[PDB]
């Protein structure tokens, strides 16, 4: 297929486009705040190998 | 919980056999398998002692 569409950004609030994504990071203490989202490591309770996600 | 882990490997010194002018297959295990080292390593000689 072929799709056309728009992305425009006037400034401050006047942001327009189809599908805004608009990620939510507030509340997370981030290593590199431009990352979006965050990593956690647990390590198993029986096996002691790492588990990351 | 807790525990401790180690990784190592052991092996046979080239020419330990002493009995040959050449290796088999040219790529050999360095591990102490029966065929590779049981009773064969020239660096060591064992004697049992009786009568003490």
From Swiss-Prot, chain A:
Record note on modification: Proteolytic cleavage at the N-terminus by the prohead core protein protease gives rise to the mature capsid vertex protein.
Transmembrane stretches, start-end: none
Family as reported in the entry's similarity comment: Belongs to the Tevenvirinae capsid vertex family.
The protein's assembly and partners: Homopentamer. Interacts with the portal protein. Interacts with the major capsid protein that forms 160 hexamers.
Biological role: Capsid protein that self-associates to form pentons, building the capsid in association with hexamers of the major capsid protein and one dodecamer of the portal protein. The capsid vertex protein self-associates to form 11 pentons, building the T=13 laevo capsid in association with 160 hexamers of the major capsid protein.
Protein name, entry field: Capsid vertex protein
Organism: Enterobacteria phage T4
Taxonomic lineage: Viruses, Duplodnaviria, Heunggongvirae, Uroviricota, Caudoviricetes
Gene encoding the protein: 24
Span of the entire protein shown here: 322 to 374 of 427
From Swiss-Prot, chain B:
UniProt modification remark: A proteolytic cleavage by the prohead core protein protease gives rise to the mature major capsid protein during virus maturation.
UniProt record similarity statement: Belongs to the Tevenvirinae major capsid protein family.
Protein task: Major capsid protein that self-associates to form hexamers, building most of the capsid in association with pentons made of the capsid vertex protein and one dodecamer of the portal protein. The major capsid protein self-associates to form 160 hexamers, building most of the T=13 laevo capsid. Folding of major capsid protein requires the assistance of two chaperones, the host chaperone groL acting with the phage encoded gp23-specific chaperone, gp31. The capsid also contains two nonessential outer capsid proteins, Hoc and Soc, which decorate the capsid surface.
Subunit organization: Homohexamer. Interacts with the portal protein. Interacts with the capsid vertex protein that forms pentamers. Interacts with hoc; one hoc molecule associates with each capsid hexamer. Interacts with soc; this interaction reinforces the capsid structure. A total of 960 subunits of the major capsid protein forms the 160 hexamers.
Name of this protein: Major capsid protein
Primary gene name: gp23
Coverage span on the entire protein: 470 to 521 of 521
């Amino acid at each position: 297929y072929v799709i056309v569409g728009v992305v425009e950004n006037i400034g401050e609030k006047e942001i327009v486009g189809s599908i805004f994504y608009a990620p939510y990071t507030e509340g997370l203490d981030l290593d590199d705040p431009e990352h979006v989202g965050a990593f956690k490591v647990v390590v198993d309770p029986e096996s002691l190998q790492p588990s990351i996600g | 919980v807790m525990g401790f882990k180690t990784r190592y490997g052991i092996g046979i010194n080239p020419f330990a056999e002493s009995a040959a002018q050449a290796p088999a297959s040219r790529i050999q295990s360095g591990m102490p398998s029966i065929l590779n080292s049981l009773g064969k390593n020239a660096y060591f000689r064992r004697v049992y002692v009786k009568g003490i």
